[model samples]
Target: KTVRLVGGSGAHEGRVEIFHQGQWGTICDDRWDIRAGQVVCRSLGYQEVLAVHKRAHFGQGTGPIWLNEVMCFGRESSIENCKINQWGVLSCSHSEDAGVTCT
Candidate 1:
């Protein structure tokens, strides 16, 4: 489970997509607390999260919405270590894709 930041102005920022089902998919921004952003950044090898983006600021994603209403403790080693929505059970479309900024 590798998380990659895509489509942002800098390297450590952008829409959060995880490799799953042999492809990449977006995370839904619904209930995306900064803790979720923290785990994402940390999981991706960043020290901490700098910011979180809702409302698809990085632009909407295509393909499946892999997660929704995610809950992370900000110290989880990975997104798969967090309790989260069932895969493909998203209440959001790609228009609500989640993004993170790491520092």
Candidate 2:
């Protein structure tokens, strides 16, 4: 899925879920890179990425495969085109999907 501006209090943030096979999971931190964070931040309309957390930065879920260790160049139009590494389920206590914040 593509990153989109979400309605929030101050900064514009967005959430993208990773779907694999027949379930949804969270992105792992095995290879979390700076470029990936940059793409997400820019996509969401953030000026500069303040930070990029892993292992349920926003929340966790149990429906689809979560994206793990995202890598981008801050110029990709979507996450699918960006370089991805390490794909698996997020074994954490988070109850919602992972998120990204920019600006």
* Per-model TM against the reference: 0.93, 0.57
**lDDT score at residue 29, model 2, on the 0-100 scale:** 50
Candidate 1: list runs displaced more than 4 Å. Answer: none
lDDT of 2 by residue, 10-57 (tens): 445534455466544455555555566667676556676656555555
Task: Give the whole-model CA lDDT for all candidates, comma-separated.
Answer: 0.85, 0.55
Question: What's model 1's TM-score?
Answer: 0.93
Model 1, 19-71: lDDT tens digits are 88887989988788899899988887889898999888899988988888578
Top candidate when judged by TM-score against the true structure: 1
